Amino acid sequence: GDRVADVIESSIGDSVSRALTHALPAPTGQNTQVSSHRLDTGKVPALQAAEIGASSNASDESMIETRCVLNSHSTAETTLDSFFSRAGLVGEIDLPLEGTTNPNGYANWDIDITGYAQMRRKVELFTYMRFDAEFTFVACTPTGEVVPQLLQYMFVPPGAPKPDSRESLAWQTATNPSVFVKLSDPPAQVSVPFMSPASAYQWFYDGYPTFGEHKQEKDLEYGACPNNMMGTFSVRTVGTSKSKYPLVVRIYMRMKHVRAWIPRPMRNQNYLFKANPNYAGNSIKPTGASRTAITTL
Amino acid sequence: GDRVADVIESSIGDSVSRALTHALPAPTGQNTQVSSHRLDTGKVPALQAA
Amino acid sequence: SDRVAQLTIGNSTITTQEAANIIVGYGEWPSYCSDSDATAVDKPTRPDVSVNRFYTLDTKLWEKSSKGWYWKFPDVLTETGVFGQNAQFHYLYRSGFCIHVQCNASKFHQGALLVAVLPEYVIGTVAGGTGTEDTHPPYKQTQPGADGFELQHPYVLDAGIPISQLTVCPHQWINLRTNNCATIIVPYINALPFDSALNHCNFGLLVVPISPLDYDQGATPVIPITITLAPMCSEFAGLRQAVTQ
Amino acid sequence: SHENSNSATEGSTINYTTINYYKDSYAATAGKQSLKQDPDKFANPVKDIFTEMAAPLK
Amino acid sequence: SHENSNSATEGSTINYTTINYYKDSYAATAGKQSLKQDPDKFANPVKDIFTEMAAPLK
Amino acid sequence: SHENSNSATEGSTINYTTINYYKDSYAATAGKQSLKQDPDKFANPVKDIFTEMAAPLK
Ligand SMILES: CCO/N=C/c1ccc(OCC[C@@H](C)CCN2CCN(c3ccnc(N)c3)C2=O)cc1
């Protein structure tokens, strides 16, 4: 029971986050209303105080004399799904015959889509994103030729044994999901759910994954969030003897059922590494084009 | 006939010149009313902005 | 009547006679974690007044050549007062913040600071200049504590992103001819209901001059910028011994 | 279809119109999203809202 | 089908009978068009219409 | 579908929601199973059940 007044009247424990704004339906661009000449004192729409942190509330109607315009231009193509649900390249896996990389007929790719700038720059517009995804695998030789070869793709979640060879016992794939397909077949394609332990994936994590002294040698772990590490994608040619052909597997991703939070400035310096935002300090370039004078086009 | 909104709602053609003032009968000089001491804040008749 | 303001929380009161309203980040107020968003089962502790109060942590000097600074939250407070102690004794922490950046001058000085809050402010390095070296920022740069840290390349916010777009984040400007402070209220921002006040910095506070400070010889040249901040709705769970990192 | 509710948007403030042939809803199409918008959350997150006609600082 | 209205003929004076399996209507078949005609627009755009029996210039 | 009842789970204490295109039900999909559980069968198969608060041996 409670009796002292400050306890009865406190707000400690209020889980209802009060919201100063609410969404409205806006299937089309706003219309324009007729406006006429205004010659007033006291009324001043053109004057703002940008210091406040809000954007101007001035509209066409109050700055010039406007006609009526019934605007039926749609706002549909700028939704998150419209913008992101377009498959882009996010991974490439080589399975050469003669080589330095994966000459043993198998390969393990850590699921990380930050190795390609087009896709990466789009997702990094937001801090947190939650989505399902459709993955498509396009395979052929390095000339784009289609050969009669059978492949096996297997998803190895964190903790499952990563194959260490084309004949690894792990390919028995009794619980991991595997896909068997020919290069002659169309590109394999599957749906992937939102698998993070968190409520959303996050493209930026300003922190460390563990406790302790964060000395020089461990600084590569700054920004590492296991909540974003979904596992390994393993591929092999299905056989006990080496394949007769050199292969390449391109990985495409199409997000769907997207939600995103906290917009942020968009990358304006070339990307260097997957794991961080490092930029080349001797080549800091302006965000865009320049000119000779401010008084000349 | 008219149909576009800006035409229907325009004031083009208003021949009634709006007047901010009107005349009053004033056959004699104005009278003077009794007044007393006023010691107020906010009220300032003596100050103008020519 | 929007230029004047009083902020009272805990045993602390702030006044200002040249304010520019108040910004409530992403349009929502701080709140305690609900029973359905929560996952941890221990009953939390909500110290209230002893930790949700204003702490004045640091003062920087604004000079005609200053490049700008940043601080990390909740890092700036992990070693201060009762808030710091709870942050150290507990694994889980969550709270919001009321940030009040102060900077006053005279009607003859000029300059404008951009005060902004950027969630998950990951810092990058110049990569050995040539960009061929995968160097990483040291702990003192990612979590600078109360003293903050000075930006090396403000134009790209030391992270390869344009400061020109920083206004997409909750902000206010301190433009000397107009106001002498910025006030921003920030709710808890994360993909989890609670997290470590030690290993994770939810957002960074950036104070960057965009229009350089200027004044004529003879005017007071020492123009401080002071940082005061208050935790709001602080909650802690997962009790054990105190740990500093 | 009596399927599982395993989509990334189950319990969203925007309803979708999708197609699916599997028992797991995340396998469904992207469909159409709801056209609601809230610019103010970013363009005008002020505590005390100020009118257009008025002087923002009075 | 509750799809988008993105066909080149959305809001036409001739209704079509089409088939489609996608959320975008322009993906639909050509179908059948309405058999309305208006030759006069080209063959007889005169202000003051003249009868057949009469002498066109009187 | 009026098929044969030849599934391994015909007459189970858990009902399934499956798809099938053949006259034999075992050809059907795995579908969804019922989410009933009975831990006690293994974790607490005691004759005379003892409360939490009490002392298990009195
Ligand atoms: C036969 C079986 O076929 N299986 C296919 C298959 C396909 C995909 C798959 O998992 C896809 C995971 C992606 C949807 C999200 C990847 N994400 C999340 C955020 N993240 C980040 C965040 C921060 N920094 C970095 N560097 C990266 C990142 O890279 C699992 C299995």
Ligand code: NA
């Ligand atoms: Na953490």
